[PDB]
From a paper:
The Slo1 channel, also known as BK or MaxiK, distinguishes itself from other K+ channels by its unusually large single-channel conductance (~10–20 times greater than most other K+ channels) and dual regulation by intracellular Ca2+ and membrane voltage. Because both Ca2+ and membrane voltage gate Slo1, it serves as a hub in numerous physiological processes that couple membrane excitability to Ca2+ signaling events such as muscle contraction, audition, hormone secretion, and neurotransmitter release. Slo1 functions as a tetramer of the pore-forming α subunit, which is encoded by a single gene, Slowpoke (KCNMA1). In this study we present the structures of a mammalian (human) Slo1 channel consisting of the α subunit alone and in complex with the brain-enriched β4 subunit.
The final protein sample of Slo1 co-expressed with the β4 subunit contained both the α subunit and the β4 subunit confirmed by SDS-PAGE and mass spectrometry. Structures of human Slo1 in four distinct states were determined: Ca2+-free and Ca2+-bound α subunit alone as well as Ca2+-free and Ca2+-bound α-β4 complex at resolutions of 4.0 Å, 3.8 Å, 3.5 Å and 3.2 Å, respectively. In each case (presence and absence of β4 subunit) we have determined the structures of Ca2+-activated (open) and Ca2+-depleted (closed) conformations. The Ca2+-bound structures of the human Slo1 α subunit determined in the absence and presence of the β4 subunit are essentially identical to each other (RMSD 2.0 Å). Ca2+ binding to two unique Ca2+ binding sites per α subunit produces protein conformational changes that splay the S6 (inner) helices, causing a wide pathway for ion diffusion to open between the cytoplasm and the transmembrane pore. The Ca2+ binding sites are located within the cytoplasmic ‘gating ring’, which is centered on the four-fold channel axis just beneath the transmembrane pore. When Ca2+ binds, a domain of the gating ring closest to the membrane, called the RCK1 N-lobe, expands away from the channel’s central axis; expansion of all four RCK1 N-lobes, one from each subunit, produces a radial expansion, as shown. Since the RCK1 N-lobes are connected directly to the S6 helices via the S6-RCK1 linkers, their expansion produces pore opening. Structural details of the Ca2+ binding site reorganization upon Ca2+ binding, RCK1 N-lobe expansion and pore opening observed in human Slo1 are essentially the same as those observed previously in acSlo1. The structures support this proposal because the Ca2+ binding sites are unaltered by the presence of β subunits.
Author numbering:
A (entry chain A): 238 to 566, 577 to 585, 592
B (entry chain D): 19 to 51, 93 to 474
C (entry chain A): 830 to 833, 871 to 1056
The structure:
């Protein structure tokens, strides 16, 4: 397009230069308007852009005839070429390039189903004041370029999050986002999908690709069934003993329902304990005030004091809550009775 | 003498020396030949996360506007001038504004990751071309209207800073502000370019090409050119101006014809059938939702407004999420005083309070008879009666179903 | 539904996939599409539960490794890694002959919901020393309380007939106590 446009522009400008500069035989060469080649070039660009200044034009009748026969081709050529050239130049990869690994600061990588509401619901829970201050940065990775609202969300949490376009199935992309130097990889699954096995399959392939590149990383992912947990276990470096997460949304929901099925309310009792919820306060005493007093609690892990670890854990149960004003709950041990 | 070259020279040597200095630093790093904390402090200052960063970025906004108005003031001055900053108000403010801009560029350079890509950024290039020459001018006690027209390119960051300050959130307004800022910025910037080049004579012509033009005349010229009118009352007579016009219109026409229809679309495509229904005192009204099309509304309205029925003071308030076509609007304009339309779904309690369904006499639901799925249309009517009874259970719903077992499902609702 | 009582008091729990459908479940609430799922009434009552509240589990399991282990062993019934390996090898739980070490797998401190109006702990039901309440629970049976499952209008003086209770997580020491109350408590393993 560039070659054709520039060639016909300069060629027809040279034609007009010759014809305009030379006089007209009928006029006895009195039509020889004094024009330079660059003046004819400017004339033709004005004409093809359909501006039509009329400061300089063709006064010879051969020049006018050539202009009339030119503009039929030229205007269609201009209006079909220049938008195409303006499109082909500059439509590039704006979210390419590498992630600089900041020294002295870990970072995570988040891929999977990445949309505006999912990123917002993740970022509030990750950057909440109730959680301990996190120096860890968040590096996204998603093959679809984000829309303007997701870009505005990134511009909001500018210093804490970065985006980098690309699939997770490319080891060049994984080295680009520095997943080997990353602290932990996260995968967000699309809950609301038309095929709960096909979305499951895509998450399978994503965990496969990440473990194929670097098996020494912690993957926190989310599945949609329980049998797919065995498929995750099929991966050699997918070991439960090493730090890893394989959340199964359907299994967790069923377990919460089956626990509230004997103790009504326990599902939302547990589900409020993980949204990091600051202590909001309303004026009047409805049920909502006393319930937001409930939902302001979360679950945290604190190492016991030498007193607490010392003597008997069952003994250090009683009066533990009053002393620290906290709720206290080498393996999975709830209700310690009987480091 | 006519010290015009020093400003352009100073800006160019700062720009290219930083570019060359950056390359030299990379060579030193090769073959072994707290910074993060000051960097992310600069980052949280650049972003609007703190109150300090918020007042900083609103000051960047305001002083970019102020420097642009100062350029519009000084455009009426002669090209070469000799002016003392202490002696006259001129350059007293611009100096402070460019000091602040130099500070802002320093903060942005500290916060930036890649030095060469930061140097090759248009918001940095405008800084490199505007903050040196005013200091050169206030040192030399002279004035040249150099590239002070470039300050209009500080309008390019308005969408970014409103995204920082959370005024811009939705995609339509974000794209609108982007298009407006880009269009106005490049219009004023290229007009200032033509003003400088056209006003200054041509060295080959010994400066006899200095056509006397004002900045607003150049603005009018460029809007004529981008709109492809081409009056030819005023044009470029300098060959540098003509060359810039030729190289301008390639970008400018495509930009105009792709932006101005988009801005005209994004402005004004609004909700024409929003707003509340005024409950007329002493007169009941009904609410009709469901499958609402032209022939269904017409067949309903003739039976409802027929002379044989006793005179009805009751008004009819429609509610339908699809905006009506022109023929349905003409039907509403026909029965103007008796019917009103209000766009919205019935599954929104804000919409239900908007149409005043609690104050309404009776709700009506018209089902689509001719549907491809007589259970799915049944299901939609189920959900509609569910939503109306969820908002206000004390209302009379007259609806229509498609089977007989669905009557039991309607009976399932408590109210 | 009705019986020789009504069926409004019947405790049900329904899954949802749309958070924005939760307003249709109840009638005595200020329904609002802006009100989030954690804030609306029937989720707080516990009778509604959508899957979308589990998005915070990603951040939770990143910030502590033990959280998923704790939730699994509290929720699905103590999935030990031996059970997970047997699942991956068999895809069907089987039965085996018990031993004393097998009978030592009754030692899960069980979840329960007890009443406060009647029972050995009903001796106070009108206090405000919730701290003394759970300390009595400790010194009685090491019964770890969780929180008060109080009725919605139990904090009111105008007596209604609403048996919808709502949960409150971690009540403080100086929290009051009506006798008409259900409590979230964990007694020791059977
Ligand atoms: C006095 C001197 C006067 C100045 C002289 C006239 C100006 C120069 C004429 C040359 C242009 C001819 C041309 O357009 O190429 C043609 C042949 O393809 C080729 O042979 C070239 C490639 C291609 O034809 P087209 O119409 O461009 O194809 C359009 C198809 N499309 C829409 C899929 C792209
Ligand atoms: O002019 C020339 C004709 O030369 C022409 O007439 C130009 C040829 C135009 C015809 C285009 C054919 C090519 C089309 C595919 C004639 O010569 P002259 O230039 O008129 O000589 C006088 C010049 N003087 C007045 C300066 C002395
Ligand atoms: C492409 C745009 C060309 C528009 C320039 C038109 C023009 O004035 O030509 C100019 C040169 O033209 C040149 O020498 C500069 C062209 C260099 C191409 C890059 C004409 O230059 P000139 O012949 O020496 O002067 C003629 C009288 N005039 C000053 C009234 C023009
Ligand atoms: C501060 C920002 C940087 C400062 C930018 C310049 C500030 C103004 C300097 C001009 C004042 C001056 O005395 O110039 C006089 C001498 O000066 C020269 O002729 C030597 C300068 C040669 C250019 C050196 C560029 C180095 C790039 C590699 C001009 O002499 P005149 O012709 O007689 O008038
Ligand atoms: C936002 C704050 C930044 C803008 C500062 C205001 C400003 O510069 O306006 C300027 C002009 O003002 C006008 O002449 C009217 C232009 C519209 C004002 C906007 C006022 O600033 P000034 O240049 O100091 O005005 C001197 C005019 N005097 C010499 C008559 C006293
Ligand atoms: C809203 C957005 C911002 C646009 C408003 C900005 C308005 C531009 C102000 C410049 C126009 C101006 O000052 O007068 C013009 C220049 O006139 P003058 O050369 O300075 O002298 C005039 C003296 N006389 C009045 C006696 C003739
Ligand atoms: C002498 C001074 C001369 C005056 C100077 C030239 C005039 C100003 C040039 C600045 C415009 C550059 C630009 O268009 O932005 C570009 C970079 O995006 C950015 O960096 C800015 C946003 C965006 O590129 P695009 O082509 O606009 O993207 C089109 C993609 N689209 C079709 C999906 C929208
Ligand atoms: O004009 C100046 C050149 O100044 C220029 O030549 C303007 C610079 C244009 C080059 C653009 C480079 C920037 C491109 C990115 C020269 O000075 P003067 O103005 O010609 O001095 C005579 C003025 N008088 C005739 C009124 C006395
Ligand atoms: C935008 C459209 C600008 C078109 C105006 C062009 C114009 O005539 O400028 C005018 C001002 O221009 C102004 O002062 C009004 C511009 C205010 C911007 C709003 C020119 O004003 P002038 O320099 O004082 O008069 C010059 C002689 N003339 C009357 C023949 C023009
Ligand atoms: C080149 C083709 C496609 C366009 C047709 C142009 C030619 C055939 C025609 C159109 C106008 C004509 C001119 C009309 C007026 C005079 C008449 C007589 O004194 C002969 C020369 C002259 C000057 C003619 C030469 C031939 C002519 C130039
Ligand atoms: C990147 C920068 C350095 C390149 C810009 C080119 C500038 C600095 C050079 C190129 C041609 C030069 C001019 C050529 C001759 C004039 C007239 C003479 O009586 C004084 C010096 C003076 C005014 C020169 C100084 C400025 C000048 C315009
Ligand atoms: C041209 C460049 C070097 C200008 C930089 C100015 C430096 C020396 C000064 C200006 C303001 C200062 C900052 C002021 C307070 C913040 C937050 C504080 O909790 C730790 C230090 C820190 C992060 C300082 C770092 C150094 C600092 C940025
Ligand atoms: C800026 C770039 C992209 C366009 C090219 C313009 C420059 C390189 C060229 C095109 C026209 C040229 C002019 C042609 C005529 C005279 C010749 C001689 O007296 C030197 C100066 C002068 C006035 C030339 C200066 C250099 C020049 C201005
Ligand atoms: Ca409700
Ligand atoms: Mg960063
Ligand atoms: Mg009316």
């Amino acid at each position: 397009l560039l070659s054709i446009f520039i060639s016909t522009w300069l060629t027809a400008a040279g034609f007009i230069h010759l014809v305009e500069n030379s006089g007209d035989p009928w006029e006895n060469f009195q039509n020889n308007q004094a024009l330079t080649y660059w003046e004819c070039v400017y004339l033709l660009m004005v004409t093809m852009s359909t501006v039509g200044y009329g400061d300089v034009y063709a006064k010879t009748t051969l020049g006018r005839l050539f202009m009339v026969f030119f503009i039929l081709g030229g205007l269609a050529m201009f209006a079909s070429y220049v938008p195409e050239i303006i499109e082909l130049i500059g439509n590039r990869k704006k979210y390419g390039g590498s992630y600089s690994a900041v020294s002295g600061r870990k970072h995570i990588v988040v891929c999977g189903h990445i949309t505006l509401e999912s990123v917002s619901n993740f970022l509030k829970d990750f950057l909440h004041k109730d959680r301990d201050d996190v120096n860890v940065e968040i590096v996204f990775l998603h093959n679809i370029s984000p829309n303007l609202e997701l870009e505005a969300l990134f511009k909001r949490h500018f210093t804490q999050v970065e985006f980098y376009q690309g699939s997770v199935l490319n080891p060049h992309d994984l080295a680009r986002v520095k997943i080997e130097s990353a602290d932990a990889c996260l995968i967000l699954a699309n809950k609301y999908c038309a095929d709960p096995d096909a979305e499951d399959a895509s998450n399978i392939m994503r965990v496969i690709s990440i473990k194929n590149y670097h098996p020494k990383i912690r993957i926190i992912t989310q599945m949609l069934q329980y049998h797919n947990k065995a498929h995750l276990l099929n991966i050699p470096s997918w070991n439960w003993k090493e730090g890893d997460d394989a959340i199964c949304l359907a299994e967790l929901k069923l377990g919460f329902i089956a626990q509230s099925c004997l103790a009504q309310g326990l599902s939302t009792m547990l589900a409020n304990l993980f949204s990091m919820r600051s202590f909001i306060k309303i004026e009047e005493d409805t049920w909502q005030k006393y319930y937001l007093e409930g939902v302001s609690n979360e679950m945290y892990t604190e190492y016991l004091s030498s007193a607490f670890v010392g003597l008997s854990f069952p003994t250090v149960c009683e009066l533990c809550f009053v002393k620290l004003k906290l709720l206290m709950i080498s393996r999975i041990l709830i209700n310690p009775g009987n480091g | 003498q006519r010290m015009w070259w020093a400003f352009l020279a100073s800006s160019m040597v700062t720009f290219f020396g930083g570019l060359f200095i950056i390359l030299l630093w990379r060579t030193l790093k090769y073959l072994w030949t707290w910074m993060t904390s000051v960097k992310d402090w600069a980052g949280v200052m650049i972003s609007a996360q703190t109150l300090t960063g918020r007042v900083l970025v609103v000051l960047v906004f305001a002083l970019s506007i102020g420097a642009l108005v100062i350029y519009f003031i000084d455009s009426s001055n002669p090209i070469e001038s000799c002016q003392n900053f202490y002696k006259d108000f001129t350059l007293q403010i611009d100096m402070a504004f460019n000091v602040f801009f130099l500070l802002y560029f320093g903060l942005r350079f500290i916060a930036a990751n890649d030095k060469l890509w930061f140097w090759l950024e248009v918001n940095s290039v405008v800084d490199f071309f505007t903050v040196p020459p005013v200091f050169v001018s206030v040192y030399l006690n002279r004035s040249w209207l150099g590239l002070r027209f470039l300050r209009a390119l500080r309008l390019i960051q308005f969408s970014e800073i409103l995204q920082f300050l959370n005024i811009l959130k939705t995609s339509n307004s974000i794209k609108l502000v982007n298009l407006l800022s880009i269009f106005i910025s490049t219009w004023l910037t290229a007009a200032g370019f033509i003003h400088l080049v056209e006003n200054s004579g041509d060295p080959w012509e010994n400066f006899q090409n200095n056509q006397a033009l004002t900045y607003w005349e150049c603005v009018y010229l460029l809007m004529v050119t981008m709109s492809t009118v081409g009056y030819g009352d005023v044009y470029a007579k300098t060959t540098l101006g003509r060359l810039f016009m030729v190289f301008f219109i390639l970008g400018g026409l495509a930009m105009f014809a792709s932006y101005v229809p988009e801005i005209i679309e994004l402005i004004g495509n609004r909700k024409k059938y929003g707003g509340s229904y005024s409950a007329v005192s002493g007169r009941k009204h009904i609410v009709v939702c469901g499958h609402i099309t032209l022939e269904s509304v017409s067949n309903f309205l003739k039976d409802f407004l027929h002379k044989d029925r006793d005179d009805v003071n009751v008004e009819i308030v429609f509610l339908h999420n699809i905006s009506p076509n022109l023929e349905l609007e003409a039907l509403f304009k026909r029965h103007f005083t008796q019917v009103e339309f209000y766009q919205g779904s019935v599954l929104n309690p804000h919409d239900l309070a908007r149409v005043k369904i609690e104050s309404a006499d009776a709700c009506l639901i018209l089902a689509n008879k001719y549907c491809a799925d007589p259970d799915a249309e049944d299901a939609s009517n189920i959900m509609r009666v569910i939503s109306i009874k969820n908002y206000h259970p004390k209302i009379r719903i007259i609806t229509q179903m498609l089977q007989y077992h669905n009557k039991a499902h309607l009976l399932n609702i408590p109210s | 539904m009705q019986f020789d009582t009504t069926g409004v008091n019947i405790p049900i729990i329904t899954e949802l996939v749309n958070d924005t459908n939760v307003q249709f479940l109840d009638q005595d609430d200020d329904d609002d599409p802006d009100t989030e799922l954690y804030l609306t009434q029937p989720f707080a009552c516990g009778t509604a539960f959508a899957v979308s509240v589990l998005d915070s589990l990603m951040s939770a399991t990143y910030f502590n490794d033990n959280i998923l282990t704790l939730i699994r062993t509290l929720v699905t019934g103590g999935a030990t890694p031996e059970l997970e390996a047997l699942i991956a090898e068999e895809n069907a739980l089987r039965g085996g002959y018990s031993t004393p070490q097998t009978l030592a797998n009754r030692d899960r401190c069980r979840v329960a919901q007890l009443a406060l109006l009647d029972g050995p702990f009903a001796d106070l039901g009108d206090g405000g020393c919730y701290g003394d309440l759970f300390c009595k629970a400790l010194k009685t049976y090491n019964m770890l309380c969780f929180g008060i499952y109080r009725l919605r209008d139990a904090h009111l003086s105008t007596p209604s007939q609403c048996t919808k209770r709502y949960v409150i997580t971690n009540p403080p020491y100086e929290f009051e106590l009506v006798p008409t109350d259900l409590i979230f408590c964990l007694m020791q393993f059977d």
